[PDB]
């Protein structure tokens, strides 16, 4: 790829976040024969069922609805070996600094708070690991546990929980255990402190000696050491800058570009990368990013960008 807009979680063989390929088919016959009236321009166009329409080219098909899906892009995949799109992950083409480390990194994760706060994937990982350690995940009745924007913005819980799969197997399994453990702790219990154990334990609440009976560890529930007698031994400017829609400096890529064929300056007016030259006698169709005739590789890698 010259450029990727999209990231998926590849469940096998990669077992990690990868660049993804976008596909559309006819929702009626399920073949790749749907010519869209208008190309996708944002996540809602490709995630909301039946949102986009066109015409199915299959002879005896009346289908007019699009169905979009994604595949891992790191190796060959079959026609419909699909993967879940991690729609919060964006390529950082405008060099936005990260809300917590202030470095320019790519890809980044964009929270769905009003501010659309930006955090790099390393800090997102660190943020999850910290919150797990400190027991700071947030409960949602219709979701389970998740995290809001790091800046604490309202209405910003991650809803698509495959985004936590990017923590990789061990942190992801700590995340998965969180709720069971939390139930124990709300009830006044205690987790075994032995690394690799962590059983949830519900001893009589006035007992200082807790025996894990898992691993047999007898501990002091106060200091968490082996049982003994006697006494135990976001920056404010960062969060203004690290916002997806905040005004930015000019990059090497211009926001007004010449048509590849007729050289007349063209303005882009939404998220679709498929441009149609507005000049009557030109009408070249081209990729805004790659500056070449519109094609299926551009479709797959970056039909739209955020
Ligand atoms: Zn893969
Ligand atoms: Zn069809
Ligand atoms: Zn960072
Ligand atoms: Zn926020
Ligand atoms: Zn234990
Ligand atoms: Zn103690
Ligand atoms: Zn032109
Ligand atoms: Zn392109």
Residue numbers in the entry: 141 to 353, 359 to 378, 393 to 465
Original authors' sentences:
Parkin has been proposed to function as a RBR ligase such that it encompasses both of the major classes of E3 ligase in one protein. Our structural, biochemical and cellular data indicate that Parkin functions as a RING/HECT hybrid. Parkin likely binds E2 through a conserved structural motif on a canonical RING domain, and also functions through a HECT-like active site cysteine whose activity can be regulated through interaction between the R0 and R2 domains.
To gain insight into the RBR class of E3 ligase, we grew crystals of Parkin-R0RBR (residues 141–465) that includes RING 0 (R0) and the RBR domains. We solved two structures of Parkin to determine if there were any notable structural differences between the sequence of Parkin originally reported (containing P223) and the updated sequence (S223). Overall the two structures were extremely similar; however, the loop containing S223 was visible in Parkin-R0RBR but not in the P223 structure. The R0 domain (residues 141–216) is a previously unobserved domain fold (based on Dali), while R1 (residues 228–328) shows the classical cross-brace arrangement and Zn coordination of canonical RING domains. The R0:R2 interface is unique to Parkin as it involves sequences within R0 as well as the C-terminus of R2 that are distinct from other RBR ligases. In our structure, F463 is involved in critical hydrophobic interactions predicted to contribute to integrity of R0:R2 interface. As is common for DUBs711 in our structure C431 and H433 are not well aligned for catalysis and implies that a conformational rearrangement must occur for catalysis to take place.
